[PDB]
Amino acid sequence: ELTEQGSATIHFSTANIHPEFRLQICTSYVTCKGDCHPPKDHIVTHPQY
Amino acid sequence: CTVPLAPEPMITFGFRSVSLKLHPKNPTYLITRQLADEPHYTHELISEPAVRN
Amino acid sequence: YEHATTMPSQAGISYNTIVNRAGYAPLPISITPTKIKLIPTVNLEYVTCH
């Protein structure tokens, strides 16, 4: 849900150590750029997303 | 029928590895298999304290 | 998470540090030594007097 001048927070999942993707939001494309880090667990109890 | 219940295994995690300390009260089957096209299953009867990596 | 550090052997003075896991929040660790003994293995042989 969008307000007029607010800021929308999304959650995503990746395998990229330097992820960079164009985020489509309803008309337009915004670029999301960052640096991901290794997680803390070796073996988890749910499959891959 | 009431069936017994073995002690909780002590799971130690590593990079692409699971270790299992297994202290059974009475002999107990450990049945493992991989969730891939080759399951490589392992039907074993463990009666003593044993570590399985 | 195995974290190794080193503390100087001096009482009274607080020793501070943090642990920076690469994608998480920093975890602060504080150790203040109070009283540092040194007890040898002591073996009585004899006593004497007047």
Side-chain angles (χ1 to χ4, degrees), chain B residues 29-51:
Chain B
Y29 289 98
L30 177 68
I31 306 171
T32 71
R33 57 102 173 261
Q34 293 180 356
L35 303 179
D37 48 355
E38 293 181 355
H40 293 287
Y41 72 99
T42 302
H43 183 74
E44 186 181 2
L45 175 65
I46 292 170
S47 301
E48 298 181 356
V51 177

Side-chain angles (χ1 to χ4, degrees), chain A residues 42-45, chain B residues 13-15 17:
Chain A
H42 292 85
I43 308 293
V44 293
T45 57
Chain B
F13 301 119
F15 174 65
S17 181

Side-chain angles (χ1 to χ4, degrees), chain A residues 6 12 16 18 25-26 36-37 41:
Chain A
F12 62 96
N16 291 314
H18 296 286
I25 176 165
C26 310
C36 281
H37 302 99
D41 287 334

Side-chain angles (χ1 to χ4, degrees), chain C residues 12-31:
Chain C
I13 301 169
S14 300
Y15 178 71
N16 288 315
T17 186
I18 58 174
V19 174
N20 289 319
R21 186 75 81 92
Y24 290 141
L27 187 63
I29 293 173
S30 176
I31 294 173

